[PDB]
Design an enzyme around this catalytic site. Sequence first.
Site, PDB file in Angstrom:
ATOM      1  N   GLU B 315      -0.268  -6.470  -5.023  1.00  7.47           N
ATOM      2  CA  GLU B 315      -0.920  -7.018  -3.870  1.00  7.47           C
ATOM      3  C   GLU B 315      -2.423  -6.816  -3.865  1.00  7.47           C
ATOM      4  OE1 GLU B 315      -1.401  -4.043  -3.936  1.00  7.47           O
ATOM      5  OE2 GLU B 315      -1.007  -3.209  -1.749  1.00  7.47           O
TER       6      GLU B 315
HETATM    7  N1  LIG Z   1       8.254  -4.712  -2.264  1.00 12.25           N
HETATM    8  C1  LIG Z   1       7.255  -4.172  -1.584  1.00 12.25           C
HETATM    9  N2  LIG Z   1       7.496  -3.254  -0.629  1.00 12.25           N
HETATM   10  C2  LIG Z   1       6.480  -2.728   0.076  1.00 12.25           C
HETATM   11  N3  LIG Z   1       5.204  -3.039  -0.085  1.00 12.25           N
HETATM   12  C3  LIG Z   1       4.794  -3.934  -0.976  1.00 12.25           C
HETATM   13  N4  LIG Z   1       3.627  -4.460  -1.339  1.00 12.25           N
HETATM   14  C4  LIG Z   1       3.873  -5.302  -2.312  1.00 12.25           C
HETATM   15  N5  LIG Z   1       5.174  -5.377  -2.610  1.00 12.25           N
HETATM   16  C5  LIG Z   1       5.845  -4.570  -1.811  1.00 12.25           C
END
Ligand SMILES: Nc1ncnc2[nH]cnc12
Lengths: 346, 346
Positions: B315
């Site tokens: 992200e």
């Molecule tokens: N699967 C996920 N769970 C929590 N935060 C995240 N940020 C990006 N992917 C994620």
Amino acid sequence: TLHALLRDIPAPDAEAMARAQQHIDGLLKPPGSLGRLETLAVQLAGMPGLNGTPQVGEKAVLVMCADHGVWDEGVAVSPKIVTAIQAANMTRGTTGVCVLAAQAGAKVHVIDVGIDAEPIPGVVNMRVARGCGNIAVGPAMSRLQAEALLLEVSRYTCDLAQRGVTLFGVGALGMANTTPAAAMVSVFTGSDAKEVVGIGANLPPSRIDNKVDVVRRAIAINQPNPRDGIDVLSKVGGFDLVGMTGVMLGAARCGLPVLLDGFLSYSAALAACQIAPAVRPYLIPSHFSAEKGARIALAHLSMEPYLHMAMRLGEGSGAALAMPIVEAACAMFHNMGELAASNIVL
Amino acid sequence: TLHALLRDIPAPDAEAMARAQQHIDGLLKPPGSLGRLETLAVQLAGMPGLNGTPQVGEKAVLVMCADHGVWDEGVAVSPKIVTAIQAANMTRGTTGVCVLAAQAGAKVHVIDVGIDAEPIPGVVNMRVARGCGNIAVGPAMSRLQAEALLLEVSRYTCDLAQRGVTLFGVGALGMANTTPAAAMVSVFTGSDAKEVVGIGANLPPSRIDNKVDVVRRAIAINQPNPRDGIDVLSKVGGFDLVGMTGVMLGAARCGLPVLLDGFLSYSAALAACQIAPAVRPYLIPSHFSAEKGARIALAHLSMEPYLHMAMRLGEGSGAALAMPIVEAACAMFHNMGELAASNIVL
Ligand SMILES: Nc1ncnc2[nH]cnc12
Ligand SMILES: Nc1ncnc2[nH]cnc12
């Protein structure tokens, strides 16, 4: 007090590491997703001088400067006086490591451990001699000299912990120093010289054979003992390499992290870890040096650098470049929210 | 105006790059010794929005958020609502990319391009639909939708250049999004799904076959054309992937650098470079993602990341982590002294 110093390097704190792992797993992300930031944060939490938590206060890069008699074997195309000129440049902030240390908010400590020139005002004076002996014909220094330098630099390093330093980096500056570094790497790892001798500061391809031969001669004549890292340092290393080993012994004794730089520093790290295996958990790699023998040295340390920058400057600039990564591991640890607070179960 | 946008991406400025190389060679160090810091500084000097010089003003990480109908195929163990929860966490500064962006002095822009939940106050709203179509049975979206999103995000991105941003990073947040990312990587590179499908957010080893099968089904049913990256995006990508491609088109159009993150972003970068090869010189890798298909994607981009952190958060946290390296290349360039000033010839 060298025996006491080595004896008293603390073990990592398993309890603090377990508490750290537990905290990281509970942060707002899939478990394990921040990869080596996670493992780095736990490694830091284990270092007793960090007080049970990954953190960075003040940062210091110690740049160890000296000349080497092996320069006379024509293993370095940079003129000898470049060590002294550049050491003076360090006091003016214009070198690579100065610029990168400033970027990282670290201070540079320039330490003359044996430059073959008049003393440079402004530079910390721990000079053993004006250059070390030519390792191609005999030892770089006596054992007494190598021991005394380790103790002095290690005491200087751990003393910086009083002024708030919690993260060191190391580097070296010394024309021809990739020659003893390669001799030491060959001795500690059992790799033939040809496998670990690099171009250093742009040595022409055609002079590589000579440099391989000079490394082999140094080993042959001195007969360093691979199981006594102080023997190896005194016989086929240099004052700057011993100086870097001293920073690692001192940081370890102080229970504090030290960032390696490149091949020169890996050679010192091999010596440090042979002398005192308890040093190893304090060492943090920075980058994967472009020098030929980098892979072999790092394998024997079971180290995988964070940064792949094809760099080979070696005077600490790599260590400075990785300080933000250490800070990033602490920020992740302290500043991330927690899964439980968002009601998320994965 | 998409055709005009692509047409008008500027070429790199060869003159500025030659002037930069010349300056770097003259700095206080052996020529080439700072390795990829050098090449990065010249690459930056070539980007017309940097005004003929490596520099960084303001920094922005754009995090593109959306849900995907392919979640229904059981390719993701995280519950769907995690996209919306985490997007809201982005507005509170508690996520990985928020923490790492803050460390790097960057601002995070959270952009909802198709989250399957009510609008999140505080988040930039560019939502195409509440989730994209399930790529296992038909397209993610229409071509019109993918084109419109590219234009909007690219306009938003280049508009940040008015407020002083000179360095972007990209990331994506969307449960199940490693599935379309792997479909796109397979399509653009011609690698079979089995070679590029990873565990994403901790998918159990036993569900990998299903995810490989779902990727193959998506490709089979949609028949994306590998030579039309907008076709591939609309058919087997997702709104968040299209969103990241849009940031790259916009940064390129603006003559400005954009840092990739991991595998999700490499998939978007493959699309961007197929749509407009003139994007490529603006793209800067950050890290080498732990995802299975990372190597294959990066080879097709002829990219070698700076950071080896075994990370797979995705992200934007990787992009944020590399911003200091870009800044370090500029500092080296501007702040180092010169050889000639020290009378040193090497
Ligand atoms: N699967 C996920 N769970 C929590 N935060 C995240 N940020 C990006 N992917 C994620
Ligand atoms: N050979 C060299 N020349 C100039 N500066 C340096 N810093 C470290 N090694 C150097």
